[PDB]
Design a protein around this ligand. Sequence first.
Ligand SMILES: CC(C)=CCC/C(C)=C(\F)COP(=O)(O)OP(=O)(O)O
Ligand SMILES: [Mn+2]
Ligand SMILES: [Mn+2]
Ligand SMILES: [Mn+2]
Length: 508
Amino acid sequence: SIWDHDFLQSLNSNYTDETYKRRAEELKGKVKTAIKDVTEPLDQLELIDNLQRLGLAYHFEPEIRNILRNIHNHNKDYNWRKENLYATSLEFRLLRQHGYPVSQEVFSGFKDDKVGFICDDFKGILSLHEASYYSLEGESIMEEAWQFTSKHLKEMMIDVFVAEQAKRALELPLHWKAPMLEARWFIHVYEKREDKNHLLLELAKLEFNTLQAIYQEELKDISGWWKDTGLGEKLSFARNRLVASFLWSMGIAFEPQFAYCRRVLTISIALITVIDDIYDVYGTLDELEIFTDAVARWDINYALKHLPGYMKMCFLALYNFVNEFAYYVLKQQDFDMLLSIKHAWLGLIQAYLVEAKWYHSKYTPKLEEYLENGLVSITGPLIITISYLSGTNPIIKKELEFLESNPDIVHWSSKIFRLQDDLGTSSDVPKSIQCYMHETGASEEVAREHIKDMMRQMWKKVNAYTADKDSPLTRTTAEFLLNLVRMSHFMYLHGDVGFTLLFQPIPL
Ligand SMILES: CC(C)=CCC/C(C)=C(\F)COP(=O)(O)OP(=O)(O)O
Ligand SMILES: [Mn+2]
Ligand SMILES: [Mn+2]
Ligand SMILES: [Mn+2]
């Protein structure tokens, strides 16, 4: 909580200057021409892998789409299949990431029916491990691939760069990282390479520092808004969690075009943090019932008349914020979404009340019963509603109605979110771990392992709903939902990398 309002206002990064923006386009063009001279399919796959891990993929989307669509037209050729675990795993991962259909049978050549997978090459095992997280439900080869690669990678810590790659893949696979999170670490790895493209490296450093400067200017505006509402002065527990909230919004939508999306997400997460503290710490059951009814009615006159003192400003801050949110969308694209966004906030508030009633009743629900309410209380359904309404123009009515129908992809992504957040609880109200221990008798350590395995199994379900080209949700909308879950995976590992992401530039 060191990055207060005064610190954010004092920042003055250089990379908002016009000379850097000019050198950026000068690099983009000279990088696009160099992409043309990458004709080898494996070199093309490694180019896409470098572009994505450097944080530059959104600057070359058509060029990446051309490479992958041509490799997909060729991968059915007779001599295309080669007995390389690294190359086969890299192609499998990239094509499945971008929605192209690839069968798990591309790995059967490396797997003996009786002994399993036969490999000792670390580069291929590491690539196969990352490809296993793109598995679908019931792909026994991919599940067996994960068991083989996971065991082998844990044995890597019974030269020095090998052990680090093994540790990073085990704590956070590529499929579970947001793009810009791994940008800084991979830029250093790419710099130390011999075959590195020097213009690609300079572009990655220049774009990273420009992104920080854009976020810092957004934080100045968001910091002023938070200071104006004065919630931190009225509630001594409303500690400034603004930079932490912006960190989540950055992971949900990092691109500069989503500035308003990040602003609404940051303020919403900050309000959720304050409201959550009221529902499971400071509020009494009667106070929480009134606050829930006030949210349900969405009536400022009723709320000012019936709410306790410390809840009046907390409600009116949320009330005005959401109504200004609806006004902005109405001014921007003439779409009325007040009923939708208000309905989503009430769903979270009612989920908070269910947990509050369970705590006072000293009731320990079954894990399945807890996750049904817990997937809403983790704000998954609300955050994707906020992300779509603040990050899409034009808003599609049928696409918004699909999110309101409680689709399966929101159902399982929110459960992973809830399970991952509950894993952040210390060994010292029952959560996922306690409900699972009470239900199976397993120890806390074993329960954590089984819960960690549940998330990986639920990601298989999400991988199916993401590849379905027939849902009303576009590919951009689904990335909001996945990046939210990916941020939960990232925050569980780092609970200051937030400071090194927003305020610490890459020395050019
Ligand atoms: C709101 C989002 C998406 C990100 C902010 C970080 C989180 C998880 C919270 F603020 C919720 O706190 P808490 O862990 O207390 O939530 P529960 O009380 O439901 O466990
Ligand atoms: Mn809570
Ligand atoms: Mn809480
Ligand atoms: Mn929690």
